[PDB]
Scaffold this active site. Structure first.
Site, PDB file in Angstrom:
ATOM      1  N   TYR A   1       0.901  -1.155   0.000  1.00 33.76           N
ATOM      2  CA  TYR A   1       0.000   0.000   0.000  1.00 33.76           C
ATOM      3  C   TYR A   1       0.934   1.197   0.000  1.00 33.76           C
ATOM      4  CZ  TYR A   1      -3.513  -3.371   1.608  1.00 33.76           C
ATOM      5  OH  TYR A   1      -4.338  -4.470   1.738  1.00 33.76           O
TER       6      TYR A   1
ATOM      7  N   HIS B   1      -1.588   1.414  -3.560  1.00 43.46           N
ATOM      8  CA  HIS B   1      -1.592   0.799  -4.870  1.00 43.46           C
ATOM      9  C   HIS B   1      -2.881   1.092  -5.599  1.00 43.46           C
ATOM     10  CE1 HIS B   1      -2.978  -3.104  -2.718  1.00 43.46           C
ATOM     11  NE2 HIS B   1      -4.022  -2.659  -3.399  1.00 43.46           N
TER      12      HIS B   1
ATOM     13  N   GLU C   1      -5.529   3.216  -3.242  1.00 39.09           N
ATOM     14  CA  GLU C   1      -6.111   2.933  -1.936  1.00 39.09           C
ATOM     15  C   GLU C   1      -5.024   2.880  -0.884  1.00 39.09           C
ATOM     16  OE1 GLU C   1      -7.682  -1.298  -2.731  1.00 39.09           O
ATOM     17  OE2 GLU C   1      -7.211  -1.312  -0.611  1.00 39.09           O
TER      18      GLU C   1
ATOM     19  N   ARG D   1     -10.247   2.289   4.163  1.00 39.42           N
ATOM     20  CA  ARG D   1      -9.313   2.914   3.235  1.00 39.42           C
ATOM     21  C   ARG D   1      -9.711   4.327   2.813  1.00 39.42           C
ATOM     22  NH1 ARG D   1      -7.672  -1.370   4.938  1.00 39.42           N
ATOM     23  NH2 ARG D   1      -7.443  -3.284   3.705  1.00 39.42           N
TER      24      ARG D   1
ATOM     25  N   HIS E   1     -14.545  -2.289   3.969  1.00 45.19           N
ATOM     26  CA  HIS E   1     -14.913  -3.686   3.763  1.00 45.19           C
ATOM     27  C   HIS E   1     -16.072  -4.015   4.696  1.00 45.19           C
ATOM     28  CE1 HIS E   1     -12.001  -5.131   0.979  1.00 45.19           C
ATOM     29  NE2 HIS E   1     -10.961  -4.853   1.740  1.00 45.19           N
TER      30      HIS E   1
ATOM     31  N   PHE F   1     -16.173  -3.478  -1.295  1.00 50.07           N
ATOM     32  CA  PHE F   1     -16.164  -2.284  -0.452  1.00 50.07           C
ATOM     33  C   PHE F   1     -17.529  -1.615  -0.569  1.00 50.07           C
ATOM     34  CE2 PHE F   1     -11.509  -2.033  -1.420  1.00 50.07           C
ATOM     35  CZ  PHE F   1     -11.036  -1.911  -0.118  1.00 50.07           C
TER      36      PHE F   1
END
EC number: 4.6.1.24
Length: 104
Positions: free
Chosen positions: A38, A40, A58, A77, A92, A100
């Site tokens: 991350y 990415h 994110e 995120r 999530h 998501f």
């Protein structure tokens, strides 16, 4: 009165911009952190209506307020674009599998 509510997590615009600043710098520096690398590319499989332009990245936002540094990412995120513009805060929590949903 959360600026963004992700499940039982409460985030302020100030928490979100602090997370976004750390993630964008990593992006700009072309570096990543954690096993899943991350930040990415976030492709938008969900088809959310982001007002800013692609590409999207994110970056994890932690309920503890600390900036992500490589451990467990959690379910939340912050999605920002190539220009360091906030696209949205997603989670999530409440979504099936790896999907998501947007934080209200």
């Amino acid at each position: 009165a959360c600026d963004y509510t992700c499940g039982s997590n409460c985030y302020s615009s100030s928490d979100v911009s602090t997370a976004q600043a750390a993630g964008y710098q990593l992006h700009e520096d072309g570096e990543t952190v954690g096993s899943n690398s991350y930040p990415h590319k976030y492709n938008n499989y969900e088809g959310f209506d982001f007002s800013v332009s692609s590409p999207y990245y994110e970056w994890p936002i932690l309920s503890s307020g600390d900036v992500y540094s490589g451990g467990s990412p959690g379910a939340d995120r912050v999605v920002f674009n190539e220009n360091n513009q906030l696209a949205g805060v997603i989670t999530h929590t409440g979504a099936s599998g790896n999907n998501f949903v947007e934080c209200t």
